[PDB]
Design an enzyme around this catalytic site. Sequence first.
Site, short mmCIF file in Angstrom:
data_model
loop_
_atom_site.label_atom_id
_atom_site.label_comp_id
_atom_site.label_asym_id
_atom_site.label_seq_id
_atom_site.Cartn_x
_atom_site.Cartn_y
_atom_site.Cartn_z
N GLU A 705 0.81 -1.21 0.00
CA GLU A 705 0.00 0.00 0.00
C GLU A 705 0.85 1.27 0.00
OE1 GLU A 705 -2.86 -0.55 3.29
OE2 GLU A 705 -4.05 -1.78 1.91
N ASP A 714 -5.63 9.31 -3.43
CA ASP A 714 -5.56 7.92 -3.86
C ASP A 714 -6.28 7.77 -5.20
OD1 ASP A 714 -8.21 8.12 -3.07
OD2 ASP A 714 -8.19 6.23 -1.94
#
EC number: 3.2.1.17
Length: 873
Positions: A705, A714
């Site tokens: 991640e 994101d």
Amino acid sequence: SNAMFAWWGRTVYQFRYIVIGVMVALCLGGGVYGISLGNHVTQSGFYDEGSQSVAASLIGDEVYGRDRTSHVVAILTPPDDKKVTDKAWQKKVTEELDQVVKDHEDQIVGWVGWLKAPDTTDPTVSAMKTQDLRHTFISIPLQGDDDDEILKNYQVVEPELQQVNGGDIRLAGLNPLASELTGTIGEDQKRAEVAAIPLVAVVLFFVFGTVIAAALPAIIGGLAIAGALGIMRLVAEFTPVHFFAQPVVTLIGLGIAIDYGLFIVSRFREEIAEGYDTEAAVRRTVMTSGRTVVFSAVIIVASSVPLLLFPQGFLKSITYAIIASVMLAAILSITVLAAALAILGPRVDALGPIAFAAPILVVMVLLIIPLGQLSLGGISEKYLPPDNAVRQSQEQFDKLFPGFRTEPLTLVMKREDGEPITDAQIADMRAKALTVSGFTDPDNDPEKMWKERPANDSGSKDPSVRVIQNGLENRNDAAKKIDELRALQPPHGIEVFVGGTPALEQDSIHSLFDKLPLMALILIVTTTVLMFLAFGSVVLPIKAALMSALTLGSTMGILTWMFVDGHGSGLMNYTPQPLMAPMIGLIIAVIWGLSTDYEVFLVSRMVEARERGMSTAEAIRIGTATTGRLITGAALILAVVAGAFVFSDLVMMKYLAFGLLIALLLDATIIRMFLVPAVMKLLGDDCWWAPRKEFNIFEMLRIDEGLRLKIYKDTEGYYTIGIGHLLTKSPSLNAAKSELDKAIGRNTNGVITKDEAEKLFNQDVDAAVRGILRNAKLKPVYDSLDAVRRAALINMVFQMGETGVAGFTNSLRMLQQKRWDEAAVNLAKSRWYNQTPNRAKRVITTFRTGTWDAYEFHLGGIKAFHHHHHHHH
Ligand SMILES: CCCCCCCCCCCCOC[C@H]1O[C@H](O[C@H]2O[C@H](CO)[C@@H](O)[C@H](O)[C@H]2O)[C@H](O)[C@@H](O)[C@@H]1O
Ligand SMILES: CCCCCCCCCCCCOC[C@H]1O[C@H](O[C@H]2O[C@H](CO)[C@@H](O)[C@H](O)[C@H]2O)[C@H](O)[C@@H](O)[C@@H]1O
Ligand SMILES: CCCCCCCCCCCCOC[C@H]1O[C@H](O[C@H]2O[C@H](CO)[C@@H](O)[C@H](O)[C@H]2O)[C@H](O)[C@@H](O)[C@@H]1O
Ligand SMILES: Cc1c(C(=O)NN2CCCCC2)nn(-c2ccc(Cl)cc2Cl)c1-c1ccc(Cl)cc1
Ligand SMILES: NC(=O)CN(CC(=O)O)CC(=O)O
Ligand SMILES: NC(=O)CN(CC(=O)O)CC(=O)O
């Protein structure tokens, strides 16, 4: 010493095709070049090239002409009980000799003997017939001006020479012997090919039980022989290479190269068994056994290089051959072989207390001392078996015609004034020579001693140099007498060199004992320092040093018991005699290198077994257990190949082949199975004494991640920070900072530190666990599995939430029951695998093997960041 192998383990897989392509090409390419090696080897290299006897020889040959009276002497026998004075028999055998010479003047100087002018009145020329006149011997000198060129001249000539007198002729002397001894090299080679190779195959096929895994270490051994022969043929261009170098290539090739591959193919097989993909499997084989094989190679090199201190070209050729063969086998085993395993993968398996240390140390200082009977000597015809025909021709030459075979000691005198040596100066030096006792007078007259050396056409005949020589009356007095003749102060303005075969032989022996102290020091220190670098211990090198030091003296013990005193000589058809002096140097290094190689393949496994996380007792039993079968299999492959060479006609070859049999059997049982497991728990916790990061879930999710130290958007457009931590879904960045400041407890203005991200990540984990422990479908599996495999399940909960991974009711059940392989296969059929494969394959691999390996060596990086579920706050 620990990341380059990871480096190379990765790339040997990526470029596995060109790697197997280029080096197979070169080894085969080296093979075609190297086949010619046998026609470019030498028989010389037993003396000290800087010695005064070699100077004496060199000067004496230059001026007086090489002595060729001992080149070839032939005994003649008239048939039907005729006698050598039979004028008809005489006429027929000489015109045969004369025809052999005219056909071969590029190789025959001529033939001399009583048969020429049989009406002579010479006492020594009439001594070339026997008293019954049924045998007479001619001397046949030959062309050439080194040993090698002269031997190649004899072998052209002796087919046509053996047939004179209808075959009733026996050939002895320097060149017949040299031909038979150098001829054993080739015979020991074909016996290795015939017996050792099939036997090796059987041992391999029993160690692996499948054709492909068994055939690989054989192909590696073949390629190393082909490559090493090409190297040594190249070394031949620049410096002479002894005959004995070729059998050394074969040994290491069939023996060490094949044993190197056995250890690696075996390690690849285990990593497949533990669930690793093959490219993972190739990397961890190289990182462990490949490192062990590499450091084995350098140890052996560290053990053979010290022989370069000795002057004999014989020991240097052997040293070069060990060096070339050994690391070509190491390099081959981590290139050609690894690439092969990277291509095939799983289809290599496709076809079909003090109570024991004491009563053992007693019996090994038992054997160290038969030494002291050890004596050393030069080459005689006794290096051949007693029933060998040419040795028998020599032994009957010296019985029928005694006194012609001589080893006169030589005083070569030279005055660099350049003008002649007068008769008073040699009468001077003669007088000084009769000073020393122990020389031969067949005349009972000192005035007829120390005659001048004979001179022939090959000699320059410079007047500023004279040689006088005289035989010795007991050759065991030679070493001291030689020192005595050199002690004589020469006349004024002349330098005197002491020569003769006893001087050459003795000077050679003095050089070994003179450099043997330092050789022993360099050898054991560098091997010691090396093992400290391979394990990190300071007592495990010293434990190996005195074990090796003890299996050395014991093996030398048996060898002297067998070859000096003869126990086993009648059984194995050899004569008991003193040993070839530079064989002691060779035997010391190679046996020492073997003893310390055994102490790496066993101990480096239990060093590995313990650094993983264990105490002593089990680490040694793990190490000994997992290596038990392999080291015996490796031991028998060496014992098989060496066992072929104990039947060599050449007695130095038997001596060496036996040294290894006694040594590798003594360590594959007495040391490895008994003595050091004893001393390994005896002193059991300070084995790893020396005065001078663990992976985790933070580092794994950091890979899957990302780790971002300042706010970012994101893939969905939401403000995220750290390891996938979602701050807000608000469009306002100030709302993200207002929330980031709240979470950290200070004004961040959008930036945090790594430890702050770690504190934020841990809070997310704790919330993920609380959820997992509160789900009836996740908590039982979760409780079932270990710390690493739990991290993999938390990763899934991060990427898709509890409800998401709770849908994997079958795979979670398989994981709860430890059926890792079944779960790995089932999870890889999911939609989650095909959407995010690089991370799913990485996570599944962590379920299969239960270690971090998929994360310690991962591909590239991630480019699409996505905030996980279970963002705490
Ligand atoms: C594979 C194992 C093979 C086993 C080895 C075979 C044993 C046969 C030994 C035959 C040696 C010939 O011995 C006879 C010769 O010896 C010396 O010269 C030799 O000694 C010098 C210094 O070393 C060199 O410079 C010379 O070139 C060299 O001929 C003498 O000076 C010569 O007058 C004499 O002719
Ligand atoms: C490890 C293996 C060891 C092998 C041991 C074998 C050793 C054999 C040694 C042989 C010594 C031979 O002896 C040589 C003899 O013949 C020559 O004289 C001849 O010269 C003219 C030739 O045309 C003629 O006039 C006459 O035939 C004659 O006078 C030499 O001048 C002398 O040297 C000696 O008289
Ligand atoms: C499990 C193992 C799998 C593969 C193993 C196969 C390895 C093959 C065994 C050794 C490699 C081939 O030979 C190597 C040796 O022979 C060469 O040529 C010679 O070969 C015979 C000599 O007796 C004669 O027929 C010829 O005259 C001559 O040219 C060289 O002269 C030698 O320097 C070299 O040592
Ligand atoms: C140094 C060594 C070793 C050694 O340490 N081997 N290690 C390898 C890894 C596992 C443990 C044993 N082996 N051999 C060997 C090779 C072939 C045969 Cl037929 C028999 C043996 Cl003894 C030799 C050797 C080297 C040079 C000469 Cl001139 C003669 C013998
Ligand atoms: N990997 C899983 O457990 C997903 N399962 C679904 C389930 O068990 O409920 C698919 C399957 O039957 O293989
Ligand atoms: N772009 C990426 O690397 C994202 N990853 C997925 C992830 O890390 O969550 C893609 C994959 O693993 O196949």
